[PDB]
């Protein structure tokens, strides 16, 4: 099993956080990937976007480590990207999977034209940046598919985006920065203030407050 080490982890394990969107609502940080494992379960599909050997020059030679960039996310609105560097490829991939689980962000999906059926594309044009890599996502008509480079296409497909238009600028040949910029653009979806979100918020009790009795009683 898994013994939680955080109050949020204890609340999640003790079957009293209804959905992962409560934590996202209160911006609480996830420090144990078992929360994501419990909430998204078998819907999460991971893959290794890249393995990069990075070397540090030493007196005796070059200390070579491997950095794994791994994307993850159920194809229904949650995506995450994780980078981990370690001495061995297998340990790097394991750490990258854990980190991508920790960094899952909710993806907001929108409409291109009329709002029939489930949302298919990004709510609006959104730009992500990671060190000279600029990735812009534009809403696309239904059935367009993901018009993107392979790395952004994979990230957007894991995000659950049915179709999108993509623009890229900079040194996108560095897969890490390309992936991080696409992840930034995707995560900027729920941070964009659209007119339908102008309604004043009704604040609800944070999980550290609405089950503080369960935490203290232990």
């Amino acid at each position: 099993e898994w013994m939680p080490v955080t109050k949020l982890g204890r609340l999640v394990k003790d079957m009293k956080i209804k959905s992962l969107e409560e934590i996202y609502l209160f911006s609480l940080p996830i420090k144990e990937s078992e929360i994501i494992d419990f909430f998204l379960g078998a819907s999460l599909k991971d893959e290794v976007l890249k393995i990069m050997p990075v070397q540090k020059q030493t007196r005796a030679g070059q200390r070579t480590r491997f950095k794994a960039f791994v994307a993850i996310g159920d194809y229904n609105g949650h995506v995450g990207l994780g980078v981990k560097c370690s001495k061995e490829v297998a340990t790097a991939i394991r750490g990258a999977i854990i980190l991508a689980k920790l960094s899952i962000v909710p993806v907001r999906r929108g409409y291109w034209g009329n709002k029939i059926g489930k949302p298919h594309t990004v709510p609006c044009k959104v730009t992500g940046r990671c060190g000279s890599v600029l990735v812009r996502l534009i809403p696309a008509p239904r059935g367009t598919g993901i018009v993107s480079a392979p790395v952004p296409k994979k990230l957007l497909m894991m995000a659950g985006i049915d179709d999108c238009y993509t623009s890229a600028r900079g040194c996108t040949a560095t897969l890490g920065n390309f992936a991080k910029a696409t992840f930034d653009a995707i995560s900027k979806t729920y941070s964009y203030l659209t007119p339908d979100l102008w309604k004043e918020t009704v604040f609800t009790k944070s999980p550290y407050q609405e089950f503080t009795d369960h935490l203290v009683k232990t």
Binding site: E47, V48, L49, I51, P53, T64, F66, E88, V89, A90
Partner: peptide, 26 residues
């Protein structure tokens, strides 16, 4: 998968470098 990892980490920059990295996950 393990054999590819071994071949890659034996010579991470030799002749059998790009192919093994591509074969890892692609």
């Amino acid at each position: 998968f393990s054999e590819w990892i071994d071949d890659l980490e034996a010579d991470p920059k030799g002749k059998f470098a790009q192919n093994l990295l591509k074969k890892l996950t692609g």
